[PDB]
């Protein structure tokens, strides 16, 4: 049923696609270090969806792609504080079970679809009416 593309070349595909901004503009992603040959540390950003308590609040995240990417899902962590089901409020780490694309990970997926999934779950109705902290607050560490 075809063969798999190894981690680093897939990450170079995702890196080049993060820099030429084709698509929504609701999501954006790139390398954290820019010179990190491991290609492990990525920074992601989601623009708040209209019609929500998240609306036009810009959230920045830290995505870590492990040695088994994209066969295994990446760890995702919010750095801008946020109240969201699945999102821990002391850490910002994401519960994989809370996100279908992370609970049901498939190697056809990319970092773009993970961020776009988080924005779609921001338009989910269990989250759109949550009480959010004042803008500008972030957890430390």
């Amino acid at each position: 049923t075809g063969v798999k593309v190894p981690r680093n070349f897939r990450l170079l595909e995702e890196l080049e696609e993060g820099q030429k901004g084709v698509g929504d503009g609701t999501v954006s992603w790139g390398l954290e270090d820019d010179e990190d040959m491991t290609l492990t540390r990525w920074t992601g950003m989601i623009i708040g969806p209209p019609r929500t308590n998240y609306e036009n609040r810009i959230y920045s995240l830290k995505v870590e792609c492990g040695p088994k990417y994209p066969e295994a899902p990446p760890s995702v962590r919010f750095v801008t504080k946020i109240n969201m089901n699945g999102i821990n409020n002391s850490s910002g780490m994401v519960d994989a079970r809370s996100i279908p694309v992370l609970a049901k990970w498939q190697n056809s997926y990319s970092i773009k679809v993970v961020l776009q999934e988080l924005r779609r779950l921001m338009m989910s109705k269990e989250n759109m009416k949550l009480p959010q902290p004042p803008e500008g607050q972030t957890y430390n560490n």
Binding site: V3, V5, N8, F9, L15, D34, M37
Partner: protein
Amino acid sequence: LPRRIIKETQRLLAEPVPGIKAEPDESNARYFHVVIAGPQDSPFEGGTFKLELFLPEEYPMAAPKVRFMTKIYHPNVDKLGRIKLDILADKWSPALQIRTVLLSIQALLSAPNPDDPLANDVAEQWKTNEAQAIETARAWTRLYAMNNI
């Protein structure tokens, strides 16, 4: 698995290229781990450089994709190990085989030429002050291209 890929992999193992190590991944037959020894009489002498090679699904119609994993000071390699050479890009021909791609990268290490620059920043200094560029490449060689194993 394409019938060309098996027969090419076998001849790369039966007769390896002098100065170059290359083997398939035991979990991916299109994925090869490569080690290239720094050519003699060059700023990279003494160093051993890791590279990755992947044969995409459309190979040999599409070129093999290869990149450095040991950071290296060279006008045709960027910060993340990508290689600029025509044979891996617009001037790839399906009649070319992996052995010649590896040999061409080895030859690029001995004849760096900055008129077409990938990382223009190192290349314009290779033009401005080639001597200090050569010794910076030697320093990087001792830093990243030794202590490899």
